[model samples]
Target: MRIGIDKIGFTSSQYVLNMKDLAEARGEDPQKFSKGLLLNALSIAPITDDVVTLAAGSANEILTAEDKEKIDMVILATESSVDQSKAGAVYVHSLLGIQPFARSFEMKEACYSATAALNYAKLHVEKHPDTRVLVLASDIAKYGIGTPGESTQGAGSIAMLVKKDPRILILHDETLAQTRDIMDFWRPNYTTTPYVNGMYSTKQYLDMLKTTWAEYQKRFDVSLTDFAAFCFHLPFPKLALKGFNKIMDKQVPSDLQEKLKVNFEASILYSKQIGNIYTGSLFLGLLSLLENSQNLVAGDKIALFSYGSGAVAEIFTGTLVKGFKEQLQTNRLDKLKRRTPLSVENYEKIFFEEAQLDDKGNASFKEYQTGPFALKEILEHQRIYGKV
Candidate 1:
């Protein structure tokens, strides 16, 4: 039973904010974002394009009528959840019209929940080979204006269909996960933005990589050279680069190092443009590598690392299937290029518009644009969504 991802899709909001413009507004050098973080721009969500719409837009691109019928589980991994009690997965299932008999739920572990969702989906497929699982990782990473995490903020979703004998990549049997009670990043339910210890989080991320990779090597008896390329949970691309270098062995040949370096850059192309999508970041990196890498081929092993703040981490490996390139969404870059750029002032307006809802819990978002699915209005504390 070779269970793994069969198809994948991604969707983000229509609006973009360039980091250069943000830097100018904040009176900082543009290189701090462009060169230091390897980030150029980030996607921003209006009130209308919340997590549900992003998830649906991505999944709608790939799911067929047969897929909807066969899917037995729908998992939504998100940190930007709209409802405190209601599961976002149920909303997605209803909007997509997936079979009602399937189980639908939401998973929360900061940025690491999506990896867990994939693992659960893999096991579920192994048990019922005919059934498929829909894993949606959707998030809107936002921080307060002039905050430390602003440049890294982004919004997007990645939808993956998991089944037996997947056409894209084959998941291996063993995956190592680690958990620790660390407060590197977190958000209280009452607060709109997160409370982040940026320097502390960076240290924890690197330390966890060393710990997990060491254990992974000892348990699996695999070497770094055995994998074609490595992808990480990219809060920003530069942090992932630092992680790669932190684990690189001194004795590795220069050519192999160069190969890994080139692939790493390819893996972060979208992250550079879109910043962090939290739970979807690692998978997004994998998608970026699968779409952008020039040297990857069938049978190549790609190693992945996933980490969430407050905090958990996992390390796993997967083998690319033959003709996997044909399964990729080739127009992703074109879509990214077509995004509308928002000025710094306009970006701030959209960012802080969450408070617009009146005390009666009634709000209409007809003015804002969205993709295929949208949060049209909130009436009496209920969210109403419709097709665009």
Candidate 2:
């Protein structure tokens, strides 16, 4: 009867641009990016990759033959769709070579869709214990070059396998999700880049955190001392710190607040290097906490808060299972460090080259990249992706 995440995997492009370099290129203070945003580098995805390719790259690494047979559903959560009409999950399902009788689809609600997908997968497994589900949160956080939002851009994916008696973390039955009709961030039908009200968006993010935390306390009758740490949807690592500090206003003792603060920093370690990954940001923080935190032990409660633009918020909790550390992929950290750093000029070429594809979808270039899968070509308006 225990439903939770059994395994986790992640993938990001091998190209990264140092935040200090970007700051100098834009004539801004380097501390504003390196210290202010708490970002080290930004992962850069090329035209040869999309959500499906990234999703496949992450999931392929952790899927066993047994998982392929047991998994009867795959849900992809993303806001960055290559084609507006098609669901990216279908392509991921085919590329991963899962069994054909599964339900597969894409869900969109900005960055918060993955948490919803996680909830759905949790419910599905509770009803059908014989089955498992694959939920992937993948996206490329792209804003135009030299824009205010440029430093927060990143591309990555997080793939999680949900099933019975998971060894990683167990999902609790209660979660509080809230929605508000606001346009803090959105992309129109024509523009590929999103339009954001930066200051307003930050305000809304903190407000959502305060609102959801208050309600969660009232309904669950739980306090911060009951949990080991808190993970959040981070646009930048600094934003998560702000939200954590806001909630720590005398609700918990100073030493407990410091302990949670330290854990929050550990949770954003990956986010600091990878920047914002849209829907995958929160779960990436979850993985970071599990992989990096030193004091975490079995049965520790980890509170999670998720937020998305155009705005939705959710608060949930999960309990860490015994031997969870054995389930993490340590090699992925080496892969991230091995990424090739891009110069501002070289990064610009890759950024603009995406817009120059011909009607036949032929791009005359692809650099050396790291991933298990990639977008090979686009023929007759169909995306051709293949194993590496």
Candidate 3:
């Protein structure tokens, strides 16, 4: 009874900001943002769009009436929850039209939440083989305008359907996870932006990877040679590259290093364009790898490492299923290429726009162009959705 990802989809804002334009606007060197961060552009959203709408739009792209009916569980992994009392999954369930009988909830622990959801989904499917689970990782990564982490801010969501005998990839039961109290990155209830110790957070990310990998190797006797490619939680492409370089010399063979390196770039292609999306960032890397890499064949192994601040880390592996390529939507790549690029000034204005929560706590938005699902209105603090 194999259980894993059956289908996957993604959504991002239509507007983007080129790193070079941002560099010039801030009086910083363009190469610093482009080469140093390994980012070409960053996705930006208007006030009318947010994590909820993005998640619904992405999930709707892949879900069918059959999927909605069969899905017995819905897990939403996000740090950018719109309300403290209501679970975002409830709104998503209504928007996607999933059956009300299913269990739906929101999970949080920074970026590691999605990996946790996936693992839980696998166990749920193992117990109820006939049921399907929908897991969504969504976020709007924002650090103030001119901060060091500003270049890494991004918005997007990744949706995955988990079921028995999945057509895309099969999850292996072997995994290693670790947790510790750390102040590397965190956002308080009162603040919209994250508080981060940039250098320390980078160190912690590498340390967690090393520790988890060590445990995984000892328990499973797995080496770098076992995997065709490795994907990490990418806050920025350069951060993942740094972790790759750290272990590359000791663990990987020279020949395999080149092969993995090529696939790693293919894995991050979409992330390089969209920037960071918190809980969704790592899986977005997996989506990029699966959709863009022509060389990956059925039965190839792919490793995933997930990390979140204040803080947890996990390493897991999955196998590519036969005919996986046929399950992907080719036009998604073409659509990403057609997105309009925003000037630095325009990006700034959109980034800082405040939502108009009324006297009754309802938010009314002016007409805005969002690809599919968008917050049409917020009535008495409850959000409304529209298909267009």
Candidate 4:
């Protein structure tokens, strides 16, 4: 029996910051962001849009009442967690009204946790073919204001439902993963943003891709030509492009290279607009590829490389299911274009607006816009959410 992603949905904060506007504000040339980093814009989350709301909003897009009933597990992967102890998945489960008999939890490991979560979801569905699993990757990639990492910061979530006879992509049985104890990037509990050695992280990302790709070829007896398109964990689209270049064989025909490049462009269309989403970045590329690429047909294999700083990496392959296009959320491009562009000042203002409680440990928000769900308030330190 085939078990894989049956449906997929994505959601992000309503506000956007164009790279040129940000560059002009920072007194730098705009091409540095548009051409150097291959980033055009990024999503910005308001105070009302935390990880829980992003997760719920994305999941809410694709899940039907029947889907909620059949889903027995809801796994959320994130690095931008609001509560230290409570799993955001529980809140999402409650808010989405999934059946109460299911297990809900959150996983953390920088950005790689979602790939692990996806694999786990596939396995769970393989075992219990009758039930579906909801796997979510949500995060707010903040690196402080006016910092080197500001341009790459983004907020979004990707919600995927895994079940038997999936309508999207089918998960193959082969996956190669590696782990290392490197401190290329990390955020301590005290810091709201992460610390990074940018150059070192870039090197490690390329090295991991080379190492994993070499082993995957030897172990699985597959070559680059075996796949139609490749997707990588895009910290930014430039890094993904570098990784893709490193692996492309020179002997491959120029036409094939061009075809792959076009497909690759399709993959990063969302990332170029939304910047980095940590755990959801790779899947976001996958969704973008599925939606934007005109060349892909059923039975074509696509390779995925997932990486997270401090650090784990995995390489896997999946086959596009027949009629997968019919299942795609077709409004993603419209959603991207419809977002309100923020002035750099407004972007920074919203970016720094954190949730603060009063003496009674209660807080409420006003004049905040979000998707179907939002962080309504915190009463006595417990979060309250409601529909928009």
Candidate 5:
């Protein structure tokens, strides 16, 4: 009856911007971006790759015809949604060529929605152990050029298959969730870029982590020393580090602190390069931890903290499954090192050149063809994405 991540499919843009170059463009020391944010580069999405295309690309990497047939649900979690009314899952399901018998939809709670979506998928698996669920966390984090949050913007997607007897990790039942009405980060219908109170948001994030960890410790009788490693929703790697420190609260033993610290470094290795991907950030941290932590064993417990702006946060734990290393995208992730580096000028130009379809919903793209998947055009006001 065990249900959790069976497979992982990850995708990112073909272009990256070196943070040092970005820092120079903004009249700042390169170390500020590199050491300050702990970010080396930022993955920049092209005009042709929106949430749908990114989701499809990642999903296609893992799902075969046999896997598609067993998938009974597709859940897409994102904040950078293309449409307000329609769920991005519909387009992804069609692009991935899943059967129509399945239900598909999108969920939003800022970055935390992916964890929420995963829990729901686990529940569905508990009911129908025979079927599978495709859960996608896709997003393009844009905060405008030369802004304080500029260094944190990133684009990527993590497509996961949830089913019985999972190979990657097993979802634990003990979880603590907290929600509050706040204005730490948000976006209006009229604006494309989100509004974030940088300092305010940071405080809220650490506070939520502290609150949820306390509740989790009390309810589950757990402590910082219980888990092998902890992963957090990494808007940036530094933020997750803060959360880890907050939870430790000076109660950490020297040996335990070093162990968790090493594990934490493994967790943020990917996110350090990928930047913030909204709903995908936490899972990206999970994937990074799995791929980079050489010391992790099959039965080790990994704690997860998920947070979103406007803001919702939760603390949960998962047990690593046997043979999970084989399920990782080490080869795929390794390829990120080879993406073409973009100049600050070229990156900014590409960022602004979005595919704004004409009144007839007709838009053609040349850049989209460069990736594994692309949005061919917006036909009849609907986005058409396909394998490139």
Candidate 6:
């Protein structure tokens, strides 16, 4: 009767900008971005492709006809909605050729929406054991040019198929979630980018972690010692490292603390290269941890801490299913290594390019590269997708 993620797929823009080059371009110390934030590169999506297209493309990579047949719900988690009145999930459903009868909707709560979708999907599967859910967390992390947050901006999406008796991690019922009224980060209806109080956001993130972790420990009677590794929502690699170190103080045996630190590093490798993906950033860290950690084995327990601004936090645990290693693609490492790199100047140029919306708000991209599943065109404000 286990319900959790059955399959996972991810998509990021082909173009990447090296952080060091960006630092040099901005006249900032290279160490500040490379070492201080622990970021290497940022993925840049073109104006033509957005969260909906990215989510649909990523989901299409892993989903089969069988998956679509059993899927009863599709939930899109994003903060970058193109239209206030429309749901991104509906667009994804149409683009992916999912069943017309399925329920599709969008969820928003900064970066926590995906986690919320995950929990809701789990509950739905429990109530109707025959049904499956598709949950996607997608976003474009954008900061205005010459802004402090620009270097951390990234674009990507993560799609998970949730079903009973999953092949990957099994979600346990014991969990803790908290919500607080805080303005550490937010975007107004009129603003293109989010407004963040950097220092204040950092403090709120840590505080939420502290509160949620304490409650999780009390309710489950488990501490850091019980888990093999931990993953955190990674706005920046350094931010996750800071949170991990702070909680490590609660655990004894210096050896365990050291091991946790090492595992934390393994968890951030992909995120350091991808930059911040908003809703998908935390699960991206999860993917990195599962793929990169050499010490991780089947049956190991892992803890996940998810945080989103304005502000909510959750702590949950999962057990790795036996033979789960076979569930992941073997070419993951090779794919990451083969990603195309962009010069800082080109990255800037792409970032500032505006989509030309026609009279009916329709736009078509002539410059975009086509993949197996991508935004082939946009007609009458509707995004068109499929293989080129």
Give the TM-score of each candidate. Answer: 0.98, 0.97, 0.97, 0.98, 0.97, 0.95
**Candidate 6 local Cα displacement, residue 104, angstroms:** 0.5
Clash totals for all candidate models: 0, 0, 0, 0, 0, 0
- Cα lDDT of candidate 2 equals 0.89
Residue 153 shift from truth in candidate 5, angstroms: 0.5
lDDT tens digits, residue span 1-388, model 1? 6899999999999989999999999998999999999999999899889999999998998999999999999999999999989999998999999998899999999999999999999999999999999999999999989999998999999999999989999998879999999999999999889999999999999999999999999999998899899999999998999899988886778888888888999899999989989999999999999999989999999999999999999998899999899889777888897888999999999966873578998887646768999888899788999898
Question: Relative to the true structure, how large is the alpha-carbon lDDT of every model?
Answer: 0.92, 0.89, 0.90, 0.93, 0.88, 0.86
Model 4 RMSD vs true structure:
0.9
Q: Give the higher-TM-score candidate: 4 or 5.
A: 4
Error of 3 at 194 (Å): 0.7
Question: How do the residues 249-335 of candidate 4 rate in per-residue lDDT, one tens digit apiece?
Answer: 878788879889999999999999999999999999999999999899999999999999999999988999999998896678788
Assess candidate 5 and give its lDDT: 0.88
After superposition, which runs of candidate 6 have C-alpha atoms over 4 Å from their true positions?
A: 376-378
RMSD after Cα superposition, model 5: 1.3
Q: Candidate 2 deviates by what RMSD?
A: 1.3
lDDT of 3 by residue, 254-370 (tens): 878888889889888988889999999999999898888768899999999999999999999999999999888767667877777888888888887777876988877776657
Over 4 Å off in model 3, which ranges? none
Q: Lowest lDDT 10-mer window, candidate 2?
A: 361-370
Q: Which residue pairs in model 6 clash with each other?
A: none
lDDT of 4: 0.93
Q: Clashes in model 2: which pairs?
A: none
In terms of lDDT, model 3 sits at 0.90
| Candidate 1 stretches greater than 4 Å from native | none
